[PDB]
Design a protein around this motif. Structure first.
Motif, PDB file in Angstrom:
ATOM      1  N   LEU C  31       0.797  -1.305  -0.031  1.00 33.91           N
ATOM      2  CA  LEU C  31       0.159  -0.095  -0.065  1.00 33.91           C
ATOM      3  C   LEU C  31       0.922   1.290   0.139  1.00 33.91           C
ATOM      4  N   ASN C  32       1.347   1.554  -1.263  1.00 38.00           N
ATOM      5  CA  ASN C  32       2.101   2.786  -1.493  1.00 38.00           C
ATOM      6  C   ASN C  32       1.637   3.966  -0.859  1.00 38.00           C
ATOM      7  N   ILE C  33       2.083   4.949  -0.397  1.00 41.21           N
ATOM      8  CA  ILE C  33       1.672   6.194   0.148  1.00 41.21           C
ATOM      9  C   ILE C  33       1.527   7.273  -0.648  1.00 41.21           C
ATOM     10  N   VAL C  34       0.593   8.326  -0.465  1.00 37.66           N
ATOM     11  CA  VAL C  34       0.568   9.451  -1.093  1.00 37.66           C
ATOM     12  C   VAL C  34       0.294  10.348  -0.119  1.00 37.66           C
ATOM     13  N   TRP C  35       1.129  11.763  -0.329  1.00 36.24           N
ATOM     14  CA  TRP C  35       0.803  12.783   0.726  1.00 36.24           C
ATOM     15  C   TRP C  35       0.021  13.751  -0.233  1.00 36.24           C
ATOM     16  N   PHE C  36      -0.999  14.454   0.502  1.00 36.14           N
ATOM     17  CA  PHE C  36      -1.665  15.392   0.109  1.00 36.14           C
ATOM     18  C   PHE C  36      -1.710  16.579   1.027  1.00 36.14           C
ATOM     19  N   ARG C  37      -1.890  17.726   0.342  1.00 35.90           N
ATOM     20  CA  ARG C  37      -1.823  19.142   0.829  1.00 35.90           C
ATOM     21  C   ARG C  37      -3.130  19.899   0.758  1.00 35.90           C
ATOM     22  N   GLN C  38      -3.571  20.307   1.904  1.00 32.70           N
ATOM     23  CA  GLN C  38      -4.521  21.446   1.969  1.00 32.70           C
ATOM     24  C   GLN C  38      -4.225  22.649   2.611  1.00 32.70           C
ATOM     25  N   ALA C  39      -4.573  23.877   1.897  1.00 29.78           N
ATOM     26  CA  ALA C  39      -4.283  24.997   2.360  1.00 29.78           C
ATOM     27  C   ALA C  39      -5.226  25.560   3.695  1.00 29.78           C
ATOM     28  N   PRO C  40      -4.996  26.417   4.430  1.00 28.56           N
ATOM     29  CA  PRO C  40      -5.943  26.520   5.521  1.00 28.56           C
ATOM     30  C   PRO C  40      -7.243  27.443   4.988  1.00 28.56           C
ATOM     31  N   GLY C  41      -8.211  26.589   4.452  1.00 28.88           N
ATOM     32  CA  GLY C  41      -9.363  27.403   3.941  1.00 28.88           C
ATOM     33  C   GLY C  41      -9.304  27.530   2.381  1.00 28.88           C
ATOM     34  N   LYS C  42      -8.457  26.876   1.456  1.00 25.44           N
ATOM     35  CA  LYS C  42      -8.234  27.102   0.193  1.00 25.44           C
ATOM     36  C   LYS C  42      -8.350  25.583  -0.330  1.00 25.44           C
ATOM     37  N   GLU C  43      -8.058  25.586  -1.586  1.00 24.38           N
ATOM     38  CA  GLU C  43      -8.229  24.315  -2.342  1.00 24.38           C
ATOM     39  C   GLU C  43      -7.218  23.310  -2.179  1.00 24.38           C
ATOM     40  N   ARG C  44      -7.325  22.026  -2.201  1.00 24.16           N
ATOM     41  CA  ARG C  44      -6.506  20.966  -1.934  1.00 24.16           C
ATOM     42  C   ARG C  44      -5.419  20.627  -2.816  1.00 24.16           C
ATOM     43  N   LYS C  45      -4.543  19.824  -2.729  1.00 26.26           N
ATOM     44  CA  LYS C  45      -3.373  19.552  -3.520  1.00 26.26           C
ATOM     45  C   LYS C  45      -2.653  18.130  -2.940  1.00 26.26           C
ATOM     46  N   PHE C  46      -1.826  17.835  -3.909  1.00 23.17           N
ATOM     47  CA  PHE C  46      -1.075  16.671  -3.063  1.00 23.17           C
ATOM     48  C   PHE C  46       0.477  17.074  -2.853  1.00 23.17           C
ATOM     49  N   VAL C  47       1.243  16.030  -2.261  1.00 25.50           N
ATOM     50  CA  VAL C  47       2.698  16.508  -1.878  1.00 25.50           C
ATOM     51  C   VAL C  47       3.493  15.729  -2.601  1.00 25.50           C
ATOM     52  N   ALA C  48       3.527  14.299  -2.218  1.00 22.19           N
ATOM     53  CA  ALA C  48       4.626  13.355  -2.811  1.00 22.19           C
ATOM     54  C   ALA C  48       3.906  11.998  -2.742  1.00 22.19           C
ATOM     55  N   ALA C  49       4.495  10.902  -3.377  1.00 17.08           N
ATOM     56  CA  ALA C  49       4.120   9.705  -3.170  1.00 17.08           C
ATOM     57  C   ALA C  49       5.343   8.577  -3.462  1.00 17.08           C
ATOM     58  N   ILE C  50       5.709   7.867  -2.496  1.00 21.53           N
ATOM     59  CA  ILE C  50       6.807   6.897  -2.640  1.00 21.53           C
ATOM     60  C   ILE C  50       6.314   5.426  -3.089  1.00 21.53           C
ATOM     61  N   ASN C  51       5.956   5.489  -4.351  1.00 19.66           N
ATOM     62  CA  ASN C  51       5.129   4.302  -5.035  1.00 19.66           C
ATOM     63  C   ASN C  51       6.268   3.191  -5.522  1.00 19.66           C
ATOM     64  N   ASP C  52       6.648   2.608  -4.338  1.00 27.10           N
ATOM     65  CA  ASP C  52       7.710   1.178  -4.302  1.00 27.10           C
ATOM     66  C   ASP C  52       9.035   1.835  -5.181  1.00 27.10           C
ATOM     67  N   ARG C  53       9.130   1.458  -6.262  1.00 32.21           N
ATOM     68  CA  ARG C  53      10.391   1.624  -7.142  1.00 32.21           C
ATOM     69  C   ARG C  53      10.837   3.017  -7.131  1.00 32.21           C
ATOM     70  N   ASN C  54       9.987   3.899  -7.289  1.00 32.59           N
ATOM     71  CA  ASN C  54      10.583   5.377  -7.644  1.00 32.59           C
ATOM     72  C   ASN C  54       9.795   6.327  -6.964  1.00 32.59           C
ATOM     73  N   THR C  55      10.006   7.587  -6.989  1.00 34.93           N
ATOM     74  CA  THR C  55       9.306   8.795  -6.344  1.00 34.93           C
ATOM     75  C   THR C  55       8.566   9.585  -7.165  1.00 34.93           C
ATOM     76  N   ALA C  56       7.571  10.492  -6.606  1.00 35.67           N
ATOM     77  CA  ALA C  56       7.063  11.702  -7.316  1.00 35.67           C
ATOM     78  C   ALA C  56       6.652  12.897  -6.454  1.00 35.67           C
ATOM     79  N   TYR C  57       7.133  13.923  -6.501  1.00 38.09           N
ATOM     80  CA  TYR C  57       6.870  15.236  -5.638  1.00 38.09           C
ATOM     81  C   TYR C  57       6.017  16.103  -6.680  1.00 38.09           C
ATOM     82  N   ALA C  58       5.752  17.356  -5.768  1.00 40.72           N
ATOM     83  CA  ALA C  58       4.824  18.441  -6.126  1.00 40.72           C
ATOM     84  C   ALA C  58       5.903  19.640  -6.603  1.00 40.72           C
ATOM     85  N   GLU C  59       5.250  20.482  -7.289  1.00 49.03           N
ATOM     86  CA  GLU C  59       5.875  21.770  -7.767  1.00 49.03           C
ATOM     87  C   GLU C  59       6.378  22.428  -6.448  1.00 49.03           C
ATOM     88  N   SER C  60       5.779  22.375  -5.391  1.00 44.86           N
ATOM     89  CA  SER C  60       5.937  23.190  -4.109  1.00 44.86           C
ATOM     90  C   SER C  60       7.081  22.579  -3.514  1.00 44.86           C
TER      91      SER C  60
END
Lengths: 50, 49, 116
Positions: C31-60
């Motif tokens: 169960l590979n993890i995904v990190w999500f981001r929500q601003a304090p009262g603004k629209e949501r977004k993702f952060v990162a995900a270590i999906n086993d073999r490789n990774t993937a981050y966000a622009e921020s």
């Protein structure tokens, strides 16, 4: 000559029947398949088949 | 759970984003598709994202 | 069976935090993890995900983070570096299993960072 012409005309009519729509949007199988999605292209396919 | 605008779209043979990317159904599907409103029980005032 | 997200304390700009999402389960490595981001009262977004073999981050958080895995513990962990006061959000963490689609969503952790 009548027998030869009758056979030739029979096969000619059979081949020429492939240019008919038979109620489908197109008489071309590829044109029917490439212009409509598969789920409801089957109606046109069945019209041509009948 | 899907968006409220695709309950009619998840039908077999229907094209659209949620069906063709998440839950594509077979053309020969035999079964009952059931849905009901859940705004009160799922929606969050801060945004159930 | 469930996921709990703890951490997100009070730190300073540029500091390092250690947030862990310990999961109640026995195959959370799958169960590979995904990190999500929500601003304090603004629209949501993702952060990162270590999906086993490789990774993937966000622009921020592009490359600024050092995502880590704890496969021997079936837990996930994110390393926070070059933190900024504009990243004041509530990070999440989620994982969906391959078999029998299901969600183990957590609660959230504050990312409050001061500015000076």
């Amino acid at each position: 000559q009548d027998v030869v012409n009758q056979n030739a005309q029979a096969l000619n009519t059979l081949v020429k029947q492939l240019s008919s729509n038979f109620g489908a949007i197109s008489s071309v199988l590829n044109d029917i398949l490439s212009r409509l999605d598969p789920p409801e292209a089957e109606v046109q396919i069945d019209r041509l088949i009948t | 759970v899907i968006r409220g605008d695709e309950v009619r779209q998840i039908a077999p043979g229907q094209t659209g984003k949620i069906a063709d990317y998440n839950y594509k159904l077979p053309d020969d599907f035999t079964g009952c598709v059931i849905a009901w409103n859940s705004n009160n029980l799922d929606s969050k005032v801060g945004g159930n994202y | 069976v469930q996921l709990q997200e703890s951490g997100g304390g009070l730190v300073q700009a540029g500091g390092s935090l250690r947030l862990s999402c310990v999961a109640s389960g026995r195959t959370f490595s799958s169960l590979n993890i995904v990190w999500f981001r929500q601003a304090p009262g603004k629209e949501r977004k993702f952060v990162a995900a270590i999906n086993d073999r490789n990774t993937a981050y966000a622009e921020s958080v592009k490359g600024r983070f050092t995502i880590s895995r704890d496969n021997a513990k079936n837990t996930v962990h994110l390393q926070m570096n070059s933190l900024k006061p504009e990243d004041t959000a509530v990070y999440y963490c989620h994982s969906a299993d391959v078999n029998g689609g299901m969600d183990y969503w957590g609660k959230g952790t504050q990312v409050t960072v001061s500015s000076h």
